[PDB]
């Protein structure tokens, strides 16, 4: 509700208390934060932060600024920039410190960080954090929620666990959370004036040499800020290295890409590090006896597993099909695909995969062609496609699934010769793979039986139904199936919808009580035509 | 990743002076916070979250326990505690603080609380706890970084207009949660002595009277 307004004084003490461990392990309120955080601009903001009773939510940030500075002897100088903002953003090299108010007008008598709640923002990977830890918060804890109220309890309000439901989809839903941002390489985060110094003594082409750094080769603080640059860029590609997106949540493309990016990333850093500025800055700190930094840059690379995790080729082998795949606009290059993309299946067999993730990619492929051939099929326009074509169509599409179910079986057998590999190992067997496709199929399978029907029908309305070939009922009921027929022709198509299936079954009862009207007018005129004999038209 | 693991000390010592600027408003350390220092199952269970890279989730609970009270017709009074809890629960009456490690790796050398993130929350009503710190947290932050960093313009994942739809019915179904209060029925307080008494007095067989608590009932303290 609204109350008494609180002061700046204590909420401002509150975040210089908060802010220097949460930033940098330390500083105790630097000035440069109260610089800015003392400014009428920020005050006056803040004063309508807490006097208006409509907003609720405020950032501020402290930014590591990277001060790009001119003069020779080095290329950045490292510095401290406070940022207010009323909008939550994503700091950019920066970590912020986002405050909701839990109630709309806050005061000073009342605890303020009890109506207050402190948010605290990532840069590292803002989407990533975001979701993971409001999964790791607030799912566990909505469930213990529900199960202490008992919201199973009382069942007139069954609409928290649609909720549950709801953040349990998203929570295994989005988990990429745009996952391959594609960041090949980074700039040098180690000490800038040796590389400045080695940029000097280089490009007078006279090898830089030890002696050219004067006391800075010996120096320990220098040494010092050499191994912590060296540690800064080792973690960052390690950080860079480690990743590695999910197999679920995206699809065959996703995984393409990030297959080539990662190729492409460790080619580039395995030809960064070598650049001549890293060898002399690695040679100079091991000259004054800095093992430390020579043994975490020679074991934690982290890429050798990488790369031979990522020898394999085959991979390419199976994306070159995938891509025709892609291009393919037809049934008979569609399959052909299949069979190509098989075929390099088979040849991943000597390699050395994940063998959850390659199933998964099995899935990926399979429900990627269900979407495909989905889009194949809107463009053949079977909204009113003719009974003949439909059937040649249907004919030419269902053999392309029966050669894709054939693969289906094949990949089964290639998964038992899986087993037979993974006995080496002899970890989790489990295996559950269905694509979405088999019910576009049934749906496709059921439209023949009613073609089918139709056509039986066509030809009989003008054998049986003609009066011996009554005349009223005759044209009723031809009245009635060919308006029934159009009725059912375009009421459903090339649709997708399993409830468009439904209302197509709706239109088949229909249709089959104007059929059962017919059967029973030609069985009264049959009846009362009979009792006469055995022979040709009396029987 | 363990490589290098911040001690139990600075940690220990980083969270009790974080905690009273929160849960007190700039407090001081209270004996709440002391057994929590003391505690050696909670020691234990930060020592394994702050190991253990499985799990990166840590909550404490700052406890307000009923305690009894004898005093002359002045309700029971409230006690504050601590409890520590490895994973989350719904705490009721009970401030909590959640940390979860923002970095999954944990190195000493890495500033503990830069590596880890800050969560707490607040006993009132669930409901409109979760609609509006998951609205005023996500959605203006989420909308601006997907308009201001190119991704609107980058087709590589159509994901992030579809998450949009599920936020804004995420927030949709949890404002609509204002239906019950939840208060059915509470047990009744009066005194553990004379319920005792009473239970002691009939599990025997007999009626409970005004003569089994004899001198009781003419006690103005116990009245």
């Not at 839903?173 to 040796?194: A, F, K, V, Y």
């Not at 891509?323 to 993309?341: F, P, Y």
């Not at 009613?450 to 029908?457: K, S, V």
């Amino acid at each position: 509700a609204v109350q008494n307004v609180a002061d700046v004084s204590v909420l401002q003490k509150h975040l210089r208390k908060l802010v220097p461990l949460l930033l940098e392990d330390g500083g105790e309120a630097p000035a440069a934060l109260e610089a800015a955080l003392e400014e009428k601009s920020a005050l006056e903001q803040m004063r309508k932060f807490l006097s208006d009773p409509q907003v609720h939510t405020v950032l501020v940030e402290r930014s590591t600024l990277k001060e790009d500075v001119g003069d020779e002897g080095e290329e950045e100088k490292e510095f401290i920039s406070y940022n207010i903002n009323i909008d939550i953003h994503y700091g950019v090299k920066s970590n912020s410190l986002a405050f909701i108010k839990r109630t709309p007008v806050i005061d000073a008598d009342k605890p303020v960080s009890s109506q207050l709640r402190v948010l605290t923002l990532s840069e590292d990977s803002p989407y990533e954090t975001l979701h993971s830890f409001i999964s790791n918060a607030v799912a566990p804890f909505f469930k213990s929620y529900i199960r202490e109220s008992g919201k199973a309890d009382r069942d007139g309000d069954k609409m928290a666990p649609s909720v549950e439901k709801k953040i349990a989809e998203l929570e295994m839903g989005l988990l990429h959370l745009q996952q391959n941002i594609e960041i090949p390489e980074i700039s040098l985060p180690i000490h800038p004036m040796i590389t400045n110094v080695a940029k000097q003594c280089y490009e007078r082409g006279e090898k830089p040499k030890v002696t050219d750094f004067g006391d800075k080769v010996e120096d320990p603080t220098f040494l010092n800020q050499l191994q912590s640059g060296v540690n800064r860029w080792i973690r960052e590609i390690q950080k860079v290295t480690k990743l590695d997106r999910d197999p679920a949540s995206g699809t065959a493309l996703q995984e393409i890409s990030f297959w080539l990016n990662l190729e492409r990333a460790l080619y580039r850093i395995q030809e960064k590090r070598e650049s001549p500025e890293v060898l002399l800055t690695l040679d100079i700190l091991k000259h004054g006896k800095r093992f430390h930094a020579t043994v975490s840059f020679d074991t934690d690379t982290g890429l050798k597993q990488a790369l031979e995790t990522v020898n394999d080729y085959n991979p390419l082998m199976k994306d070159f099909p995938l891509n025709d795949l892609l291009s393919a606009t037809e049934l008979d290059k569609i399959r052909q695909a299949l069979v190509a993309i098989f075929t390099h299946l088979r040849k991943i067999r000597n390699t050395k995969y994940p063998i959850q993730r390659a199933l998964r990619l099995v899935e990926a492929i399979s429900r990627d062609l269900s979407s495909q051939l989905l889009k194949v099929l809107g463009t053949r326009k079977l909204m009113h496609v003719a009974y003949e074509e439909f059937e040649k169509v249907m004919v030419a599409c269902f053999e392309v699934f029966q050669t894709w179910d054939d693969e289906y079986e094949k990949l089964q057998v290639l998964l038992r010769d899986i087993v037979k590999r993974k006995r080496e190992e002899n970890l989790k067997m489990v295996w559950r793979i269905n694509p979405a496709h088999r019910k576009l199929q049934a749906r496709l399978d059921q439209m023949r039986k009613f073609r089918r029907q139709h056509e039986q029908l066509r030809a009989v309305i003008v054998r049986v139904l003609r009066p011996q070939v009554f005349d009223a009922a005759d044209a009723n009921a031809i009245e009635e199936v060919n308006l029934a027929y159009e009725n059912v022709k375009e009421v459903d198509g090339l649709d997708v919808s399993k409830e468009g299936t439904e209302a197509w079954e709706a239109a088949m009862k229909r249709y089959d009580e104007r059929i059962d009207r017919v059967e029973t007018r030609i069985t009264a005129r049959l009846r009362d035509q009979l009792g006469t004999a055995k022979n040709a038209n009396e029987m």
